[PDB]
Design an enzyme around this catalytic site. Structure first.
Site, PDB file in Angstrom:
ATOM      1  N   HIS A  40      41.140  42.000  46.375  1.00  0.00           N
ATOM      2  CA  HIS A  40      42.440  42.055  45.723  1.00  0.00           C
ATOM      3  C   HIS A  40      42.578  43.286  44.813  1.00  0.00           C
ATOM      4  O   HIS A  40      43.571  43.407  44.121  1.00  0.00           O
ATOM      5  CB  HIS A  40      42.703  40.788  44.924  1.00  0.00           C
ATOM      6  CG  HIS A  40      41.921  40.626  43.648  1.00  0.00           C
ATOM      7  ND1 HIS A  40      40.799  40.001  43.500  1.00  0.00           N
ATOM      8  CD2 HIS A  40      42.213  41.080  42.392  1.00  0.00           C
ATOM      9  CE1 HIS A  40      40.404  40.034  42.275  1.00  0.00           C
ATOM     10  NE2 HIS A  40      41.261  40.698  41.568  1.00  0.00           N
ATOM     11  N   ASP A  84      37.098  37.373  49.175  1.00  0.00           N
ATOM     12  CA  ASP A  84      37.604  38.448  48.278  1.00  0.00           C
ATOM     13  C   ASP A  84      36.508  39.491  48.021  1.00  0.00           C
ATOM     14  O   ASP A  84      35.870  39.534  46.988  1.00  0.00           O
ATOM     15  CB  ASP A  84      38.042  37.822  46.984  1.00  0.00           C
ATOM     16  CG  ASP A  84      38.814  38.783  46.058  1.00  0.00           C
ATOM     17  OD1 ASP A  84      39.245  39.833  46.508  1.00  0.00           O
ATOM     18  OD2 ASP A  84      38.960  38.417  44.908  1.00  0.00           O
ATOM     19  N   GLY A 175      41.246  42.940  35.176  1.00  0.00           N
ATOM     20  CA  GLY A 175      40.642  44.273  34.824  1.00  0.00           C
ATOM     21  C   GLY A 175      39.163  44.317  35.092  1.00  0.00           C
ATOM     22  O   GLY A 175      38.612  45.365  35.360  1.00  0.00           O
ATOM     23  N   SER A 177      38.007  42.432  37.383  1.00  0.00           N
ATOM     24  CA  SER A 177      38.152  42.144  38.858  1.00  0.00           C
ATOM     25  C   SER A 177      37.404  43.141  39.672  1.00  0.00           C
ATOM     26  O   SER A 177      37.556  44.309  39.370  1.00  0.00           O
ATOM     27  CB  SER A 177      39.543  42.293  39.320  1.00  0.00           C
ATOM     28  OG  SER A 177      40.252  41.984  38.137  1.00  0.00           O
ATOM     29  N   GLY A 178      36.646  42.685  40.632  1.00  0.00           N
ATOM     30  CA  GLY A 178      35.867  43.632  41.494  1.00  0.00           C
ATOM     31  C   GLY A 178      34.488  43.997  40.918  1.00  0.00           C
ATOM     32  O   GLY A 178      33.638  44.509  41.642  1.00  0.00           O
TER      33      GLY A 178
END
Ligand SMILES: [Ca+2]
Ligand SMILES: [Zn+2]
Length: 223
Positions: A40, A84, A175, A177-178
């Site tokens: 995402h 994801d 933020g 995220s990943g």
């Protein structure tokens, strides 16, 4: 990261900032030309920033490399956030040193109770938005599947796990995220989702990397 602490410059050498004119997601360096992040976090025009601590100041040790291609997992579902995960290939290889190093992929999954390190430049407020200049860290445990599923009934798949605190106050957030969830020196999770940030009984949910090691290896081998 909500309720975390300042990591210290370059103490998380595998952490990368995905930038498109601003920091929008984190990622992990797994070898000199590839990074793993969350599906995402996909967008075009990604510049991967390595060796960072203060993302708004060039302090030295930074390496800015453009992404040559981003590979979102083919079965990624943006509504459930199942699968994801995303791989990013760098236009040129990064110069690895003690400030820029890759993290190892796991050989087996981690058990509940395992303590992990989560980091990132995401929001630090559960209520409101404050984005830090330097990297924040949080130590959090992997929760048991029953507690995770009881918190998010019908939304947890086998490719996800919960980590955090049910009392609230400490969690990863938008933020982050990943970015990485490292347990015993292995990359076990990717910051994926959660209800709000640091809310009571709503732990963070992460992509379960051990389920994607063969996929990561086969993909990198063919690209
Ligand atoms: Ca910097
Ligand atoms: Zn996110």
């Amino acid at each position: 990261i909500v309720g975390g602490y300042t990591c210290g410059a370059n103490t998380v050498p595998y952490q990368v900032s995905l930038n498109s004119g601003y920091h929008f997601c984190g990622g992990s360096l797994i070898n000199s030309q590839w990074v793993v992040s969350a599906a995402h976090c996909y967008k075009s025009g990604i510049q991967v920033r390595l060796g960072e601590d203060n993302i708004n100041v060039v302090e030295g040790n930074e390496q800015f490399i453009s992404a040559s291609k981003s590979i979102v997992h083919p079965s990624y579902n943006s509504n459930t956030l199942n699968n994801d995960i995303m791989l990013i290939k760098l236009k040129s290889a990064a110069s690895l040193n003690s400030r820029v190093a890759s993290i190892s992929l796991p050989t087996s999954c981690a058990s509940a109770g395992t303590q992990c390190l989560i980091s990132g430049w995401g929001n630090t407020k559960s209520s409101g938005t404050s984005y830090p200049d330097v990297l924040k860290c949080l130590k959090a445990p992997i929760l048991s599947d029953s507690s995770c599923k009881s918190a998010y009934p019908g939304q947890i798949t086998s490719n996800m796990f919960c980590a955090g605190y049910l009392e609230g106050g400490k969690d990863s957030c938008q933020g982050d995220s990943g970015g990485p969830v490292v347990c015993s020196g292995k990359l076990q999770g990717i910051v994926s989702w959660g209800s709000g940030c640091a809310q009571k009984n709503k732990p963070g949910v992460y992509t379960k990397v051990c389920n994607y090691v063969s996929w990561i290896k086969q993909t990198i081998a063919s690209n």
